């Protein structure tokens, strides 16, 4: 399918269409303002992925453990029996907590890499 | 602290707040022009980091040696007894020289990587 075709699919299946939605994210004064705001939004998301240490990746694994309080569902339950819309609602209240942890994790990684590189 | 809280701190301590200022870099016709110019500036800095081979990193080590003519201070003197404002003034006259060297270093690295990959 095309843009948002996987919206009703399970979380697992929809991960194979991540590039389709990505391509459609970027694709008289009020109209120009709208284009400028769309650009700023896109850049804010790219900057956020940069800060976390993901950069140009659509799937990015991290070192932040799952708290289990954010969601206590089984791994197969989440990936096989839920859509992304349901998941986004389910953990909306913890989004900023997760983002904060991701930023801190990358900062420690960068310092450790620098110190590892400093060894002769 | 928050945005620019580390401005008066030593160079070492301020490196732990690099993400805070980064987040605040992106955050009627004249106002729209101002937003467009802010976007162009941001992209120019990101392109420059890309050319140097750093991409999505806040701390990036390189292969360009320090000339010692640009600054002859001790490593601990620079990192423990100076702020970033003082440092920026101290080496302002050598900024373009350093940038040129960084670009050349990455170009050689890219060719060497390509030739290393070409080996069967």
């Amino acid at each position, epitope marked *: 399918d095309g843009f948002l075709g996987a919206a009703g699919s399970t979380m697992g299946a929809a991960s194979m269409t991540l590039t389709v939605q990505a391509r459609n994210l970027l694709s008289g004064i009020k109209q120009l303002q709208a284009r400028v705001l769309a650009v700023e939004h896109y850049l804010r998301d790219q900057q956020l992925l940069g800060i976390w240490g993901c950069s140009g990746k659509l799937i990015c694994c991290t070192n932040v453990p799952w708290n289990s309080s954010w969601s206590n569902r089984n791994l197969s339950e989440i990936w096989d029996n839920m859509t992304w819309l349901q998941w986004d609602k389910e953990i909306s209240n913890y989004t900023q907590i997760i983002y904060g942890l991701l930023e801190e994790s990358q900062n420690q990684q960068e*310092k*450790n890499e620098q*110190d*590892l590189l400093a*060894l*002769d | 602290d928050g945005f620019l809280g580390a401005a008066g701190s030593t160079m070492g301590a301020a*490196s732990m707040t690099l993400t805070v200022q980064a987040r605040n870099l992106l955050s009627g016709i004249k106002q729209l022009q101002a937003r467009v110019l802010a976007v162009e500036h941001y992209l120019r800095d990101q392109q420059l980091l890309g050319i140097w081979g750093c991409s999505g990193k806040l701390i990036c080590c390189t292969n360009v040696p320090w000339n010692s003519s640009w600054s002859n201070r001790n490593l*601990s003197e620079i990192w423990d007894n100076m702020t970033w404002l003082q440092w920026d003034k101290e080496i302002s006259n050598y900024t373009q020289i350093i940038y040129g060297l960084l670009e050349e270093s990455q170009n050689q690295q890219e060719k060497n990587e390509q030739d290393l990959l070409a080996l069967d």
Partner: antibody
Amino acid sequence: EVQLVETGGGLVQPGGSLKLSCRASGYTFSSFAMSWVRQAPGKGLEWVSLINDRGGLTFYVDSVKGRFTISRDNSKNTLSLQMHSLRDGDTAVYYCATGGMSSALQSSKYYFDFWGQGALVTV
Amino acid sequence: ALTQPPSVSGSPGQSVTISCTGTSSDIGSYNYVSWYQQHPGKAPKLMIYDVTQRPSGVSDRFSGSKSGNTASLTISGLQADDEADYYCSAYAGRQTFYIFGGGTRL
């Protein structure tokens, strides 16, 4: 002025475990890398383990890589080495020392700057 | 491990050299060959670091150098209280952090 005192256990049998902790004073603990060095009763010195100043990045000698854990608490000014298995060849006087590494923004060390008195671990 | 003479001695006041010999992957490649003095019953203390550097508080009679894969410590003006077990310690890179030599009984 600067002091390091090792505290730990005595006689351990093979297959057990023993935790050895070094207490530091007289300097900023969090500003220096720490390491452990051991001396067998009839031999010279050998390096055992190294931990950086933050404590997140550690290195070990291969002979103890799967047996010893090195950690530090910079708020408690405490360096701890938790040893497992403890073979007969591990009997030695263990010392904690300041030095052995520098976190990129500091001048190079690659030497052990300050040594404690040591504690004898007998298997 | 690094090779050191089992025993070194000389007359009081004489300049006595204790050598330490390694290989190209350690003493040769890296100019980080420290020296320690271990008095019997005491913990080692740092005497020399890097190649030619001396810690503050250390007498100027202790000095050294490096040539090829051989490092040496020279103690001028030998005193009765200088007889201790001396060790060399060389940086050997990231895979092997430090290598100590056998002790020399001065």
